[PDB]
Design a protein around this nucleic acid. Structure first.
Ligand SMILES: NC[C@@H]1O[C@H](O[C@H]2[C@@H](O)[C@H](O[C@@H]3[C@@H](O)[C@H](N)C[C@H](N)[C@H]3O[C@H]3O[C@H](CO)[C@@H](O)[C@H](O)[C@H]3N)O[C@@H]2CO)[C@H](N)[C@@H](O)[C@@H]1O
Ligand SMILES: [Mg+2]
Ligand SMILES: [Mg+2]
Ligand SMILES: [Mg+2]
Ligand SMILES: [Mg+2]
Lengths: 300, 65, 212, 102, 143, 184, 71
RNA sequence: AGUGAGAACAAGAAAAACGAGUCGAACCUACUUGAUCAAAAGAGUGGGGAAACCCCGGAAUCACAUAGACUCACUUGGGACCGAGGAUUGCAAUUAUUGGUCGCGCAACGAGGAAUGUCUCGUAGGCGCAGCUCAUCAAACUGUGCCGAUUACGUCCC
RNA sequence: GCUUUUGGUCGGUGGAGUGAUUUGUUUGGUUGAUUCCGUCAACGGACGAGAUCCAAGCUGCCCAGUAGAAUUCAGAAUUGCCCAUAGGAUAGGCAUUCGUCGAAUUCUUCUCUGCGGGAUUCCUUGU
């Protein structure tokens, strides 16, 4: 599809991206990297460089693993390998509070549609929930993961996906685990849920975009990409699936199950995806790369 | 004195290793007789390649190795 | 104030250094193996480690009674302040301080030097030690002195980690012809609780774990 | 409050933390409103002698060091409640000192 | 109705200069209370001024900067101060300004001298026995 | 408002070039507000050619135990040197220095490589030995002289810039080249 | 930053045997595995093991490595 | 001769004695005084068991548009030698213990023959400061900071 | 202390030789390193080297009436017309200064420090 700009501001691999969930949001993507900083971008309006940074969000020491956005607020979260979580104001650019209870790297953070509770997934195998008031409320136990918890997503009941090859589903308010679903046999890199809250796709080292539903616990159609999957994202409208892989970046359909787009750069340096993001409407695609710059793809 | 450019450093020579054997291209003015001429000469001091130096008598060549 | 905290760590070290020398001279044939003293209000503890607890204790505790009040009259303790105990070493083969005092007596009882030293190393290596090294230096054979070392098993020597793993003690043997010095080095095997040996492995052993 | 300051001094770094963190984990159970354990600067003590007992050789030396670890904790409990916090059989080589501030 | 204030630090050998950068009606930069026209050697007043000068005088327009330096002697307190000021401008533009206005003026600092921003990690090397200094040995004589 | 530094707030770096095109990479003409910079120019091999040439004069003054470590002095001592050079020459003094460095060291020399063969001199050493032999010789001039050091240093820089033989360096620059011409 | 000791190289082959599926071409993720699969006390060796493991993962993309015993 | 800016490592008091099982004094120190008149002292009065007092540790190199004296001389360089007061350490100062004051400075020494030692970056060199010896005495040694380069990044010639 | 700031030594069992003794422990590249890769009548081990330990540099958590900081009201000081005897160079909503041995009320930027991150030839393109 269409290719605009190159959008190069980080110094280090862009490990996560997220677009804000509102209209006239004035910032395009919040991209988050291996340099230890996160950057809120803005439109260029001098395009002849698809976008300029608005605010660099500095204050992590180690590698920053994931980013998340509030839905009805300007607030955003970053989770890093310095075993801490910081909450930010994309209006101001400034951190409010540091969430610190992990003893290992914090591989995944997500922020509820109820706009009031934190979730965190780290290498210390424990999924912990906070309030926005800074205090630990509860942490999820009694049947927890045996190895690293890699991803987390709230299903607009938050879902796991991990390194003990299983994907566990639970509510946030009660903490009891609904189902301890498992299909992959090798570790789960990414977990994301459709906007209807009905079905989720999960990738990993197994090389299959092995897909589920949250309704019954049924393995649906799965597709292989024959290469380890970095991140899966869903389009909000025009139901497609974009998958970040070692081999390439390609967009799959659900009913066609075939590449509707195979996204290729200049054609000399591949610069693998490790992070992708769709906008709030679904019109343009943001994909984050090693060899650090961030490619942005607009619809055909 | 003609100004020649070091296109190759052939290794540290002499007993004490202070002299450097280079291969210097003479860099003349391209209509000259002795244009694009390369000489194998001894340089005293720290010399990397692509380092210009002045030459008093360019008709000598040093005995290599 | 009172002495400074810098001045009290000194006098608490010279306390333990002098207490160690007294018991090393007394309890040499009782198989002495160390002291730990615990100080608090109302009482000062002293625990003695030995191999022969029927001998460092008297017939009714007579020997430790005298050995108590020798520490009391020297360091000016009052009645009730100083209490002593005897604990035994659980292994006796991993304590280099006990084995060198026995090897001191194997030579002083006019046994052969090499027969005595291999009797240590057989007893140390059957007691679970990873390695042992006995060095006897002096006038072993005649007028001019020699040095012999006798070895078995592992022995780490160059690290600063050998303070954690290798137990050492050197004594003097007063022969009729001169003076012989004996050394005994024992590399401690195991005992993750710290009974005899460190918890952590050796600094270079990697030991990759097997997957489930 | 009475504001009793306990001084934990020790020569072992692993024994001074195993007292202080144990002493602090006692004084949370009565909700005493402590002021947290501060780490006063560790004082190292150098004696740099010669190695030789004789006179000759290369004039080699060896520096010996001895670090004193030093912690204080301030707690507002009365004077027989702080003896409840203090009374437990510690490791050997750790000195605790009860002091009343003003 | 608000307080815009930023504290930064700089270190050169042992000189730790803490620069409290705050917004005021007038620019007023003074190192330990001396107003930077009065730092006494004209050589070392020019190293503290090129924290301001390589980026422009316009960017320090209404900023009151207070540099409090201790440790490390005469020349090291200039490199500690000029780094505390040059880091002090940028950390005043990490907040309170966008990233486009910064990171041009960060790179104007980095192009000129790398030590306006990072640190010079060099410390004294210890004296050893048998040596008068870190390296110079005692004189051997042979006869 | 980046006002492109002069040198002591007086002498510009705008017009500097080198007559010796052999020595353009090794004489650095980058600008500074003072000679003193306290950077590590000695880690890599050729990095001291990127050091500004007016600093390298200040480093050459810090010799003989009475000067080791006195860089703030040598910056002051060069401040009056460059102003005297302006009064002798009526030119930009920094161009007078770059013209002095370019003429100050011998293009050829003679060492034993095997006999006493004549060997070419690298452009790096020719910048080193020009700075070295001008700080030397101006130091020996003012040793028991009425003249100050900023005059004796200013005289060696001027006479080497003109290529006159009155400079200490140009007496030795010509002695080495004629010995090298006879030891071919 | 020189030759890896046989303590580093023998241990790094054992990580590739027992844990081939958990490892890829990155240092900073392979390091986090080796902290959970190797019980050693030094962080200096665990950095060197994760360097030589990453090297012999690029060698297994090309072809066979001697002494690898992948089975 | 002035004046300014301004470090890090560190040390610090006592016994089963003599005094009021608890407290004093021995140790280092600020501050005042001495002072209607030289230093060096001598005294009060506080504080400190030493991250708590010394201490905002006011080291010395350095710095200075100081509108300061000298001006190339064995000289206001150098301070060896020794004369005369004086005061502290000690049970005792002579073969000056040490400091301070005024003399001496007409004692070589003007950058060092053959030879020779150490060193590759916060380094060499310069600069002082602590501790250690220690009642009194550092041109020592063990440490620490300050100012801060030249050259090489080579070779097997010795 | 010094042989020696060097990378060196030792068994076992197999091979070789009447034997002292060899082999392993090596010709080839490589590293500061018998450090590694390859070869290999050797194969399996032990020590030394590396690792571990201390100190310094960047950093996390914890932390302070034995470390420090900002603020806000009060109190005090300067306050402009001023161009040195001859007087250069050099930043500029609410001016500034602090035994003033002030009150308050929010903080950890620097400080201290027990365990912990970070460096691995990691990435890149010639040998
Ligand atoms: N235990 C270290 C030993 O280092 C030795 O090698 C050493 C030598 O090759 C060499 O040491 C030389 C020394 O020979 C020569 N006599 C003096 C020289 N300064 C030393 O240099 C070494 O030490 C100094 C540190 O002060 C550093 O300047 C330099 O980086 C370092 N190469 O560098 C190595 C030290 O890093 C041997 N490989 C070995 O004996 C041993 O491993
Ligand atoms: Mg008993
Ligand atoms: Mg000597
Ligand atoms: Mg003579
Ligand atoms: Mg045999």
């Amino acid at each position: 599809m269409n290719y605009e700009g190159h959008l190069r501001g980080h110094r280090g691999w862009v490990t996560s991206l997220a677009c804000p969930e509102q209209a006239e949001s004035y910032i395009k993507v919040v991209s988050t990297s291996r340099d230890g900083t996160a950057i809120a971008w803005k439109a260029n309006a001098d395009r002849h460089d698809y976008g300029l940074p608005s605010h660099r969000l500095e204050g992590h020491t180690g590698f920053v693993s994931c980013v998340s956005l509030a839905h009805a607020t300007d607030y955003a979260l970053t989770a890093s390998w310095d075993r801490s979580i910081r909450m930010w104001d994309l209006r101001n650019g400034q951190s409010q509070r540091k969430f610190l209870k992990h003893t290992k790297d914090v591989l995944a953070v997500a922020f509820s549609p109820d706009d009031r509770l934190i979730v965190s997934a780290g290498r210390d195998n424990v999924v912990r929930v906070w309030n926005v008031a800074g205090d630990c409320m509860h942490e999820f136990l009694r049947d927890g993961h045996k190895d690293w918890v890699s991803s987390i997503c709230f299903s607009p009941i938050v879902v796991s996906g991990s390194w003990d090859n299983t994907i566990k589903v639970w509510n946030v308010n009660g903490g009891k685990c609904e189902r301890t679903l498992k299909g992959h046999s090798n570790y789960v890199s990414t977990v994301t849920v459709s906007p209807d809250g009905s079905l989720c796709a999960s990738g990993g080292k197994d090389g299959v975009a092995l897909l589920w539903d949250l309704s019954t616990g049924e393995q649906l159609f799965k597709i292989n990409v024959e290469s380890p999957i970095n991140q899966i994202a869903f389009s909000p409208n025009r139901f497609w699936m974009c998958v970040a892989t070692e081999k390439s970046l390609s967009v799959y359909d659900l009913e066609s199950k075939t590449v509707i787009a195979e996204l290729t750069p200049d054609g000399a340096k591949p610069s693998e995806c490790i992070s992708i993001a769709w906008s709030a409407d679904g019109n343009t695609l943001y994909s984050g790369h090693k060899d650090n710059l961030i490619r942005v793809w607009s619809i055909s | 004195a003609q100004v020649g450019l070091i296109i190759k450093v052939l290794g540290r020579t002499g007993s004490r290793g202070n002299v450097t054997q280079v291969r210097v291209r003479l860099m003349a003015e391209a209509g000259s007789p002795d244009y694009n001429r390369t000489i194998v000469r001894n340089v005293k001091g720290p010399c990397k390649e692509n380092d210009m130096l002045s030459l008093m008598e360019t008709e000598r060549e040093a005995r290599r190795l | 104030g009172p002495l400074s905290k810098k001045r009290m760590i000194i006098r608490d070290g010279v306390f333990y250094a002098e207490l160690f020398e007294f018991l090393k001279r007394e309890l040499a044939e009782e198989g002495f193996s160390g002291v730990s003293y615990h100080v608090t209000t109302l009482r000062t503890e002293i625990v003695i480690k030995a191999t022969k607890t029927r001998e460092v204790l008297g017939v009714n505790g007579r020997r430790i009674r005298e050995l108590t009040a020798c520490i009391q009259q020297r360091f000016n303790y009052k009645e009730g302040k100083l209490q002593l105990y005897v604990e035994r070493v659980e292994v006796r083969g991993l304590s280099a301080m006990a084995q060198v005092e026995s090897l001191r007596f194997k030579l002083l009882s006019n046994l052969q030097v090499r027969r005595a030293a291999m009797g240590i190393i057989r007893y140390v290596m059957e007691s679970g030690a990873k390695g042992c090294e006995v060095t006897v230096g002096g006038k072993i054979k005649g007028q001019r002195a020699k040095s012999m070392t006798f070895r078995d098993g592992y022995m780490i020597k160059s690290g600063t980690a050998h303070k954690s793993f290798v137990d050492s003690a050197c004594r003097h043997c007063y022969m009729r012809a001169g003076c012989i010095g004996v050394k005994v080095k024992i590399m401690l095997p195991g005992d993750s609780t710290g009974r005899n040996g460190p918890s952590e492995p050796l600094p270079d052993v990697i030991t990759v774990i097997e997957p489930k | 409050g009475q504001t009793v300051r306990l001084t934990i001094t020790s020569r072992n770094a692993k024994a001074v933390e195993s007292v202080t963190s144990q002493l602090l984990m006692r004084a949370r159970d009565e909700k005493v409103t402590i002021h947290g354990p501060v780490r006063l600067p560790t004082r190292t003590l150098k004696i740099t002698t010669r190695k030789t007992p004789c006179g000759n050789g290369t004039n080699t030396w060896d520096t010996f060091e001895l670090k004193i670890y030093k912690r204080i904790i301030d707690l507002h409990a009365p004077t027989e409640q702080v003896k409840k916090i203090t009374s437990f059989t510690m490791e050997s080589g750790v000195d605790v000192s009860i002091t009343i501030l003003d | 109705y608000a307080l815009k204030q930023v504290q930064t630090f700089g270190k050169k050998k042992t000189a730790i200069a803490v620069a409290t950068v705050t917004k005021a009606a007038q620019c007023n930069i003074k190192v330990n209370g001396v107003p930077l026209q009065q730092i006494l050697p004209d050589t070392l007043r020019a190293k503290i001024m090129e924290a301001i000068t390589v980026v422009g005088s316009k960017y320090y327009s209404r900023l009151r900067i207070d540099v409090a330096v201790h440790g490390g002697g005469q020349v090291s307190q200039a490199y500690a101060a000029r780094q505390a000021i040059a880091k002090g401008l940028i950390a005043f533009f990490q907040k309170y300004h966008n990233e486009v206005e910064k990171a041009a003026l960060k790179d104007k600092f980095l192009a000129y001298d790398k030590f306006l921003l990072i640190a010079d990690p060099r410390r004294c090397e210890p004296k050893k026995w048998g040596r008068h200094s870190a390296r110079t040995r005692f004189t051997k004589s042979y006869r | 408002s980046s006002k492109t530094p002069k040198l002591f707030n007086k002498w510009s770096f705008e017009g500097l070039e080198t007559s010796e095109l052999a020595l353009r990479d090794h004489i650095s003409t980058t600008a500074a507000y003072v000679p003193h910079t306290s950077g590590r120019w000695q880690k890599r091999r050729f990095h001291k050619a990127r050091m500004p040439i007016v600093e390298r004069l200040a480093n050459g003054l810090m010799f003989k135990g009475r000067g080791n470590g006195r860089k703030l002095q040598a910056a002051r001592l060069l401040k009056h040197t460059l102003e005297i050079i302006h009064l002798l020459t009526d030119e930009n003094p920094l161009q007078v220095v770059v013209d002095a460095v370019s003429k100050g060291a011998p293009r050829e020399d003679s060492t034993r490589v095997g006999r006493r063969q004549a060997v070419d001199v690298s452009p790096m050493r020719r910048v080193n030995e020009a700075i070295y032999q001008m700080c030397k010789g101006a130091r020996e001039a003012a040793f028991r002289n009425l003249k100050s050091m900023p005059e004796c240093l200013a005289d060696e820089i001027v006479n080497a810039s003109k290529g006159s033989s009155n400079s200490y360096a140009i007496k030795k620059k010509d002695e080495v080249e004629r010995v090298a011409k006879a030891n071919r | 930053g020189k030759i890896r000791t046989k303590t580093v190289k023998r241990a790094s082959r054992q990580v590739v045997e027992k844990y081939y599926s958990k490892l890829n071409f990155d240092f900073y993720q392979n390091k986090r595995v080796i902290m959970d699969v190797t019980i050693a006390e030094s962080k200096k060796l665990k950095n060197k093991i994760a360097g030589y493991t990453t090297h012999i993962m690029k060698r297994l993309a090309r072809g066979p490595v001697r002494g690898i015993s992948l089975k």
